[PDB]
Amino acid sequence: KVFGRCELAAAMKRHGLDNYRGYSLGNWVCAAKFESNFNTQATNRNTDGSTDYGILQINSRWWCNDGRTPGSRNLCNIPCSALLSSDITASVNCAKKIVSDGNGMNAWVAWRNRCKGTDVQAWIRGCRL
């Protein structure tokens, strides 16, 4: 599924990401834009052989099992394919664990490089939320 901008903001809010660990909703929409262009089916291989999955490009090195990342962990206790669903619940619940792991949203390199220090509220401007 490819979400609209305000549609995804609303779904993330419904799932409790708005201001989760102090990160206002625009942070999450910004991250999802650059990670996946709001496409739940996005997958991308990492240089270490792991893969990033879904709208927030959650990796199999640490967070999910895809059966082909030797020596990895599955700290969200989910198959990586669950992160590709049109239902964003698994991606959101796993994102909550990730952002709670100590480094906040810096866990998403794309957030640190493209959203951190920017006017992220712009990503939810005009949305009825």
Side-chain angles (χ1 to χ4, degrees):
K1 173 170 171 71
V2 177
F3 280 80
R5 176 178 69 90
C6 294
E7 185 193 13
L8 180 64
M12 291 176 149
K13 174 167 178 190
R14 181 58 201 146
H15 284 86
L17 273 183
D18 49 310
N19 222 23
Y20 190 86
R21 293 281 181 180
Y23 292 90
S24 68
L25 186 57
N27 287 284
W28 299 100
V29 177
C30 183
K33 182 67 172 186
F34 294 126
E35 294 292 8
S36 65
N37 209 20
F38 304 151
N39 178 10
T40 65
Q41 295 196 76
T43 59
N44 288 286
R45 187 70 57 76
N46 299 308
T47 59
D48 75 347
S50 69
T51 299
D52 288 348
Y53 297 85
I55 203 150
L56 286 168
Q57 287 291 277
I58 288 167
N59 71 77
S60 64
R61 176 61 182 85
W62 299 106
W63 303 109
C64 63
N65 177 242
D66 62 10
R68 63 135 198 231
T69 310
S72 72
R73 308 295 300 267
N74 175 18
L75 296 172
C76 290
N77 190 35
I78 55 170
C80 300
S81 61
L83 299 168
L84 306 181
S85 180
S86 59
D87 183 334
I88 67 171
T89 301
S91 282
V92 171
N93 289 341
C94 189
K96 288 181 177 170
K97 187 173 316 292
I98 297 169
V99 75
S100 296
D101 190 56
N103 288 337
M105 283 195 77
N106 299 288
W108 288 270
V109 174
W111 176 87
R112 176 168 58 76
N113 288 332
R114 306 180 76 177
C115 304
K116 187 177 191 183
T118 76
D119 176 18
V120 296
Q121 181 58 42
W123 287 96
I124 59 169
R125 183 166 313 156
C127 302
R128 188 211 179 53
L129 296 170

